[PDB]
């Protein structure tokens, strides 16, 4: 069983290998996260040097096997019985007015470790937009993400809004459309129709001078009883 693996406290590792309108880049991310509370405690450093793009813009692409999903809940929770064989996260998250990502993440436990390869493709992004024109305030709001199921291919679906914040008071939306299916043959819990309650908080770490983003997150499974 895979609920059995995030009983305690997990070390986390994120890579992505990005590529948006041309600006090609690599993060690098690691972490902890504790299940149980459904807390992430994560840090994400630029190797290739500037960031393009927000780093708020990428904060979903950086784990939903960490939420918390409550006793009476158990038997919805998708992400953990894919491990440790684990998951392919795929997402296309289209900006209002503007371009879009596409990601591919391969979700899977190394070891003890639970780690996150993705790669990013964004394209027809606005040079002088809310993106590429870096206009974006330095938060993340609370949201719900929506789940499915997908017995045809014997995973789930997900679909969600999220509204990030522009300089001048504005709201720059994000909407997101997800797509998880297993690594492994073996047996995966497919889901009645519930919600995961994000929270996020960003902040910077006072003596690092490489790009980067430490993030705080809160996610639980609710919408059922």
């Not at 290739?48 to 096997?65: A, D, E, R, S, Y």
């Not at 937009?129 to 929506?146: A, D, P, R, T």
Request: charged residues 25%; aromatic residues 10%; glycine residues 8%.
């Amino acid at each position: 069983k895979g609920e059995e693996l995030f009983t305690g406290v997990v070390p986390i590792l994120v890579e992505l290998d990005g590529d948006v309108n041309g600006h090609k880049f690599s993060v690098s991310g690691e972490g902890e996260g504790d299940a149980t509370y459904g807390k992430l405690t994560l840090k994400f450093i630029c190797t290739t040097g500037k960031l393009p793009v927000p780093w708020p813009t990428l904060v979903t692409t950086f784990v939903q096997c960490f939420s918390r999903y409550p006793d009476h809940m158990k038997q919805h929770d998708f992400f953990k019985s894919a491990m440790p064989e684990g998951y392919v996260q795929e997402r296309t998250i289209s900006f209002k007015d503007d371009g879009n990502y596409k990601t591919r993440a391969e979700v899977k436990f190394e070891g003890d470790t639970l780690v996150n390869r993705i790669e990013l493709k964004g394209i027809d992004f606005k040079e002088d937009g809310n993106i590429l024109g870096h206009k974006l305030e330095y938060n993340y709001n609370s949201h719900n993400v929506y789940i499915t199921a997908d017995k045809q291919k014997n995973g789930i679906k997900a679909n969600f809004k999220i509204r990030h914040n522009i300089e001048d008071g504005s709201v720059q939306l994000a909407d997101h459309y997800q797509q998880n299916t297993p690594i492994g043959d073996g047996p995966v819990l497919l889901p009645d129709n519930h919600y995961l309650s994000t929270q996020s908080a960003l902040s910077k770490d006072p003596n690092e001078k490489r790009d980067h983003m430490v993030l705080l997150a809160f996610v639980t499974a609710a919408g059922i009883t």
